[PDB]
């Protein structure tokens, strides 16, 4: 369930900051890869979040702009982890700026993006099991 992978990822990024908001191996491997990615690929994430200026009125377009750029010329697992971590970081930034109502909005946008643009690639490339073997 794509909603549940989104909700568990976001819940985790927010709990790491002190904010409260087997399939278990997938969630666990995704948490570890995103934590790893946020340290190792600091430069790529800083470029992604550089032109954000997060407000409720611009958030949808900021998310759509970054995710369209990320996947424009293809899908791989690296970009999928980066998608979860960029969504996570937008949620953390939303709470930090007293825009916590964006968290549910971002979760919706991430679930729709997975269902409509990433589901086919995941299913054609060995599913979440291939992710766990490769990154786990």
């Amino acid at each position: 369930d794509n909603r549940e992978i989104v909700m568990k990822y976001i819940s985790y990024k927010l709990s790491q900051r002190g904010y409260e908001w087997e399939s278990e191996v997938v969630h666990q491997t995704l948490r570890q890869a995103g934590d790893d990615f946020s340290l190792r690929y600091r430069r790529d994430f800083a470029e992604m979040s550089s032109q954000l200026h997060l407000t409720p009125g611009t958030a949808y377009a900021s998310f759509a702009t970054v995710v369209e750029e990320l996947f424009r010329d293809g899908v791989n697992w690296g970009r999928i982890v980066a998608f979860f971590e960029f969504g996570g970081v937008m949620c953390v930034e939303s709470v930090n700026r007293e825009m916590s109502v964006l968290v549910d909005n971002i979760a919706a946008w991430m679930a729709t993006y997975l269902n409509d643009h990433l589901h086919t690639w995941i299913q054609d490339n060995g599913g979440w099991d291939a992710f766990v073997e490769l990154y786990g």
Partner: peptide, 10 residues
């Protein structure tokens, strides 16, 4: 196309 450092492992 390699545009991000995470693309290199793929």
């Amino acid at each position: 196309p390699i545009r991000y450092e995470w693309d290199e492992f793929c």
